[PDB]
Amino acid sequence: MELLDVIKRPVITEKSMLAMDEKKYTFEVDTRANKTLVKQAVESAFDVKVANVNILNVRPKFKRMGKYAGYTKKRRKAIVTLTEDSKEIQL
Amino acid sequence: KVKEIRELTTAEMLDKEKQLKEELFNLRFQLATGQLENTARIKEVRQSIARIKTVLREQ
Amino acid sequence: AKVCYFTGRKTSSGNNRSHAMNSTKRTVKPNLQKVRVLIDGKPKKVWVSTRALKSGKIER
Amino acid sequence: MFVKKGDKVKVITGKDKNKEGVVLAAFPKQDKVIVEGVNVVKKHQKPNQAAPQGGILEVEAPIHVSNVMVIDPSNGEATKVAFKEVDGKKVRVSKKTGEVL
RNA sequence: GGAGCUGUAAGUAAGCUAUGAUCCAGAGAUUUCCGAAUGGGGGAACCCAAUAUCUUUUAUAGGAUAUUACUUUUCAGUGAAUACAUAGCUGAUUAGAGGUAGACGCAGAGAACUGAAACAUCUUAGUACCUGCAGGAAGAGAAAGAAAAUUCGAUUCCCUGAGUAGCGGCGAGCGAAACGGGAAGAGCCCAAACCAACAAGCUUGUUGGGGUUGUAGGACUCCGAUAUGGUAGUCUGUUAGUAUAGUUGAAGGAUUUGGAAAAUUCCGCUAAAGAGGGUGAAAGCCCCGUAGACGAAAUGCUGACAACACCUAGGAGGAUCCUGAGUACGGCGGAACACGAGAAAUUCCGUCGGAAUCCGCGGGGACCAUCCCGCAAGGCUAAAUACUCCCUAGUGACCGAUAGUGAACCAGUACCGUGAGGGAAAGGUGAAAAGCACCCCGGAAGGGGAGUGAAAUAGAUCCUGAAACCGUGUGCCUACAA
RNA sequence: GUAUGAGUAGCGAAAGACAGGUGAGAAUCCUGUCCACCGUAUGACUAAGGUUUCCUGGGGAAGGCUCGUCCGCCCAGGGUUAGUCGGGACCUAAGCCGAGGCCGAUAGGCGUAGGCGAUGGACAACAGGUUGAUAUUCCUGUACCAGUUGUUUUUGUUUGA
RNA sequence: CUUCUAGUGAGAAAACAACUGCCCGUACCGUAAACCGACACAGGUAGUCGAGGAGAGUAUCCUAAGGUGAGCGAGCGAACU
Ligand SMILES: [K+]
Ligand SMILES: [K+]
Ligand SMILES: [K+]
Ligand SMILES: [K+]
Ligand SMILES: [K+]
Ligand SMILES: [K+]
Ligand SMILES: [Mg+2]
Ligand SMILES: [Mg+2]
Ligand SMILES: [Mg+2]
Ligand SMILES: [Mg+2]
Ligand SMILES: [Mg+2]
Ligand SMILES: [Mg+2]
Ligand SMILES: [Mg+2]
Ligand SMILES: [Mg+2]
Ligand SMILES: [Mg+2]
Ligand SMILES: [Mg+2]
Ligand SMILES: [Mg+2]
Ligand SMILES: [Mg+2]
Ligand SMILES: [Mg+2]
Ligand SMILES: [Mg+2]
Ligand SMILES: [Mg+2]
Ligand SMILES: [Mg+2]
Ligand SMILES: [Mg+2]
Ligand SMILES: [Mg+2]
Ligand SMILES: [Mg+2]
Ligand SMILES: [Mg+2]
Ligand SMILES: [Mg+2]
Ligand SMILES: [Mg+2]
Ligand SMILES: [Mg+2]
Q1: Which of B26, B44, D16, D46 is most exposed, with the fewest beta carbons within 10 Å of its own?
Q2: Inter-chain residue contact B31 with A9, CB threshold 8 Å
Q3: What HAMAP family does this protein's entry cite (chain B) (predicted)?
Q4: How far apart (Å, rounded) are the C-alpha atoms in residues A38 and A27?
């Protein structure tokens, strides 16, 4: 796929902010994606030199609204750890 | 819109598509935050990407 | 399949009717023999029947 | 629809019979219409709509558009509608007279 | 098409729209992944690759696109045992797969319960089931026929024949066909004799011409037409219509009741429109519409009309040649024919044997003779007939929520089951949410006032609101009675 | 649908008591002190299976065989970070599939090559900390395997490393 | 994996610096109230660790680390089970 549709959005949570304060940023990603593609995507989207990338894929979380029950969509969340001698992405 | 898009040339169409794509990226970020109000700009950008790719394909 | 290449004679069914005409089902198989026949310029071992072998008309 | 926003209008049926009024909005998928001054219902309201008492509003409920009769803008007598191709363009036209709208 | 539009689905935000939106119809593009799934694998919706180009990165790693299954048909190149070669391999090509419509029809295979008051022949039944082939229909189909009339002229389907003639442990039961009447209507090709051409090795394979039949026909020998009609064909075109959006489309206002008028009364109007539905209640004249009159840029479809294409000849002779061979037929064994081996014709399957061909052959219910009718063993063929997953327009002395589809409600769902599989329940506020601001009790729920509303004992368990059942109170009776 | 039995059987092996607190409300929730039970387990890892039951903050309509301020219940949010662990890009057994092929009323059955397939074989990491929830994964140190680019030092240039 | 050559071959070896290393699982229960048994069911559920005194011992009694206090109770102390 294309590098900007690879990434979808960031994950604003307490854990993610605590990681932002340690220079590694969370991002939701195309579920079909790849770690090297996340790396390429961020490197082309921010001119920042990436150091490491971790990935999780989150299960679909059960939910319901009245009679009707279902599943939250699957997600894939990458954690992009940057280098020193590098910028800090601004969100 | 489709009029000026059909007036454009190929490399210009593709540059415009890439720029709309970057705008959509940034809008997804601003929507993940509470930093955006005009949400319909999202659908507008996606619509316009579709118009451009359709014009390329139909050329 | 187990079929004469030429005439198409194949297995069928029939009835054994006893002296009291008690009926039971049987297989009725034709008299097929495997024969090195000159199919389309090539020799080949193929099922084929006596009724087609009688005529000459097909070579070995 | 023979009723359209921006049209002085007479009512045929209801407790607000023979009253006049204009069209504030029209719901064609319901075949209803809203008319200022007509069918003013008393809605017990909550303050979640920037009303810092909650209070009791008075607001115009819809009206079914078949309980409605348009007005000639040059006669006052209310009429029925025909459609005519004037100048190539299709417009509403009065019955009882050839006045447009 | 002409102003509200962002579905169900409120509500908030943001916004779009005469620069003509939403919406509707036709065509085109995009069309993730699985699935015949087909690059290889696999526990479906996952994984791993090869090759070519391009891209990322200092460079790897990474990424995008395209191709890569098998089998069949043809073609080419290589090329084993094995020399010639063939097989095989590779590469280009060509057309198949699989599911639908729990329906229809051809073929293969093929039950039993049941009935016979048991039961074996028989019946159920060539039904159900399974499988293959399919097509919009299929299958059958232009007489080796039906008859007895010297006559009807291809099949199919309805009526009738007829529950007859027959079959049958002569039992139970099974059960025709033809005549007649109708619906629909159409007939065509090929092999062969011979002729011309090619080739190998005077015949004999290929192409073309010729010629398809029973009052026998054709080849062949002679006589003239160059004709004359038809077509069951073609994205050859035009033309007309029609299907898929749509537009227009007449005529009423007042009194009484009432929350509301469409009801009542009054005088009217209109009708190629009094079909139906909705609208605060029962409306010909309020609305959607109806009758009626117009309309399609675009894609289909149907029918004509021209071009193209294909068929289309006549009269004598029968010297000679041809007229469908392991075929018809027969024996044995079995089936289908209404017909159960019976006197068993006719048709078909297996097996074995095994004819003549115009002075010829088959049938006419064993069979022989005479007579009559027809000419098999090669192929095709529309129409009337059957059926409806579906689409449109509709209809009902069909249902109206225990009914009608299992399902009017997010139903093949929840649930049960390892699984195949089985399989529910559950509709209605009000005209309109106008759905109870505010106050009181209370933790809240839930009540009580107030208020909306015609109505709240119409307030989410919502129209009506039976009975069982559970209570409250009250007139009479009841603690020596079975 | 509602009765009857009937406000009955039953409330599913075992030790809790007290003070305070929260709270409208406390045997039942929280904190604390004593007490008792398990201890080749009633403890700590972990495969399968379950599949969100985990953590935080609220709640007490229903469920919990009582209650309930509480919960594996309800509601809103979040949470699962691997070159080295396990599995695949490595191997194969049993067993499965199966080009071609053989056999067969059809359908299909068998089976070669070649593949699939662990419960086995091979294969480079571990000490601590850290969160409310993850830990040979994150963090700090110290490594290891496979590979890439560059610099330096060597040696092989076709009787050829 | 080691070796052999056949083959292939002009580039290979080491030291150093830097860099790269994909996909699935990773929560939690797990001799259980989360699995199978219709239930928060006296049942069943593979493997690893599984301390101490006395003891041959993983037997047995009481304890350690650690974990539990059993999802109805109060009283009275009858027959009967
Ligand atoms: K009996
Ligand atoms: K046919
Ligand atoms: K009406
Ligand atoms: K017979
Ligand atoms: K293993
Ligand atoms: K011990
Ligand atoms: Mg991972
Ligand atoms: Mg595949
Ligand atoms: Mg019987
Ligand atoms: Mg009949
Ligand atoms: Mg009208
Ligand atoms: Mg009505
Ligand atoms: Mg009237
Ligand atoms: Mg005969
Ligand atoms: Mg025979
Ligand atoms: Mg029903
Ligand atoms: Mg009812
Ligand atoms: Mg007495
Ligand atoms: Mg007394
Ligand atoms: Mg009792
Ligand atoms: Mg208990
Ligand atoms: Mg013990
Ligand atoms: Mg918890
Ligand atoms: Mg309770
Ligand atoms: Mg909690
Ligand atoms: Mg097999
Ligand atoms: Mg093998
Ligand atoms: Mg864990
Ligand atoms: Mg319990």
Answers
A1: D46
A2: yes
A3: Ribosomal_uL29 (MF_00374)
A4: 9
